[PDB]
Each structure stands twice: as C-alpha cells, then as structure tokens.
Structure 1
Amino acid sequence: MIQRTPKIQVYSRHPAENGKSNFLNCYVSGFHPSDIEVDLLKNGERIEKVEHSDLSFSKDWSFYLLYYTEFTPTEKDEYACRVNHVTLSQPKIVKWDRD
C-alpha cells in the first residue's frame, strides 16, 4: 500500500475568451488513495454548485483533482477549499489569497 497527502492550491482564473468571468479553483494533487472529499467554501459555507470536478491519475497511485466554478468575489467575502482525506486527521482548509 501507499498513501500520500494531497497538495492543495487555491487560485482564481479568468478565461481569456471571456475575461469578465472569474473561476475559483481548488487543485488537489498527488494524492493516494483516491477516496477524497473536496469543497469550495464561501464565508465558511459549502458552495453547493461547483460546475467542474476533473479527476485524473498519472502513475496508478497518484491522483489529481481540479475542482472549480464561476464566482464573483467581493473584497469582503472569504473563499477557501476544504479537503478531507485519510491522510488528514482534521479537514484541511486552505484560504484563497485574493491576489
């Protein structure tokens, strides 16, 4: 057996073809086993509608998830990604840096 803790990165992107749109991304990488729970949070509340959840693997024991959806951030709201995985004794919450 092998188990590897996910790396978690939270960032925003504007698609170049529609630059007014903005997407909140949580990229969860290099994890094993593949069992996982991932949410985007707005002010601590789970965002129920997440448009995209793309899972892949490289080696048979290395998984990658890109979990992202359109959002409209204001200066006051706080966004984050929350991950649960067998390697994490507590849920890991990674806050989005606004810049």
Structure 2
Amino acid sequence: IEADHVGTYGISVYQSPGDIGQYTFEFDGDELFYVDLDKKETVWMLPEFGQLASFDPQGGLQNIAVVKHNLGVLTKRSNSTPATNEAPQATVFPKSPVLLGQPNTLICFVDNIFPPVINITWLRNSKSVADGVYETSFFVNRDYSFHKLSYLTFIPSDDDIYDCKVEHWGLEEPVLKHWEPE
C-alpha cells in the first residue's frame, strides 16, 4: 500500500508435494537475487549488484526449513485442504525492436501462475528449442499468485517464427502464444 519504494525480502515459498522451494529478495517488482537451494549460493540477477552487496546463503536455507515446517502444520491444522489451480496468462514481446540479423531477446511473460509449478517452452517453427534460453524466479503478486519470465536469445529473420509454450495443471491443455516479426 501507499509507499514510494517497497523492499520485499526473505520471500520464502515451499510446496508440500515435491519438497519444492524458492528463496528470494525483490525490490520494486525486480529480483535482487535468489538463493540456489541446491548449490547453496546467492545468485544475483544484476552481477554489478553482487559486487556491491552480499547475502549469506545459509539464511535462505534456514528459512526454507521454517517454511517447510510451517507448511506441514497448516496442512495438518487444515484437515488437508489442497490449493486450487489457476489459469495463467502469457505475453510475448521482444526486448528491443526487431532488426533482422541483429541479436535480440524474445520475452515470454506469464502472470497469475498458481501453484508455482509451470512449464515454459520456446518453439521455433515447432521445434522445442533449448539453449540461449533463460528463466526468472517466480515473482510475487498482490493476490499471492505469481508471474515468471522466460527469455529466448535469438537471431531474427523474416521467415521462421516462434511460439511460447505454457503448460500448467490449471490449463486443460498447453497455451500457445504466437509471436512473429510479420
């Protein structure tokens, strides 16, 4: 609510089926960094940022344990009521203007994701391409749902085309968001 800058910290998410965890720090809608729970290390999104600030990775692991604990409880304390699935959206768009031959990044914005278990796949003329592909941590939404981003590093050409493929237990079948320079 009413406030210039907003610092979202210690965001700890955990999912019962699957021992699935995510620990993140956000600022004004932007990810400061996330802690790999496996590698056990702070990963900043802006490497410049990492060189000026630091975070102890054990803090994040430490919080997941709590979150992990707390879940079971509420789970119990709640006659084991499952979470209701939702239908996510999808918007694709280029980082910068299309200019054939010149490197560009295709962005696939997904919002209203819940639960935080989604599959996002890039399709180049129907060819599940994987490489030069990047993805972001789940972002917090007001209604406690989420939204994630995927990035496709590509070379534009007025011939081939693309299609961001989204799969979520909330959609009867994969949603296809088509984008093309033409």
1:48 and 2:130 aligned: yes
Q: Tell me, which stretches of 5 or more residues in structure 2 are unaligned?
A: 1-82
Question: What is the Cα-based RMSD across aligned positions, in Å?
Answer: 1.9
Q: How do 1:1-99 and structure 2 match up within 5 A?
A: 1-14=83-96, 20-55=102-137, 56-59=139-142, 61-98=144-181
Give the structure with the larger strand fraction: 1
Structure 1 distance, partners of 2:170, 2:176, is 14
Rg larger for: 2
Q: Tell me, which stretches of 5 or more residues in structure 1 are unaligned?
A: none
Give the structure with the larger helix fraction: 2
Structure 1 distance, partners of 2:122, 2:104, is 14
Equivalent pairs, count: 95
TM-score scaled by structure 2? 0.47
- Farther-moved stretch of structure 1 (77-86 vs 54-63): 54-63
Displacement of 1:59: 4.3
Q: State the SS of the aligned residue for 2:158.
A: coil
Q: State the SS of the aligned residue for 2:117.
A: coil
Deviation string, structure 1 residues 36-89 (Cα, Å, up to 9, x no partner) = 111111000112114320022234731111100211121110101000101111
What percentage of residue pairs aligned between the two structures are identical? 27
Higher relative contact order (CA 8 A, sep 6+): 1
Structure 2 distance, partners of 1:60, 1:35, is 17
Deviating above 3 A after TM superposition, structure 1's stretches of 4 or more consecutive aligned residues are none
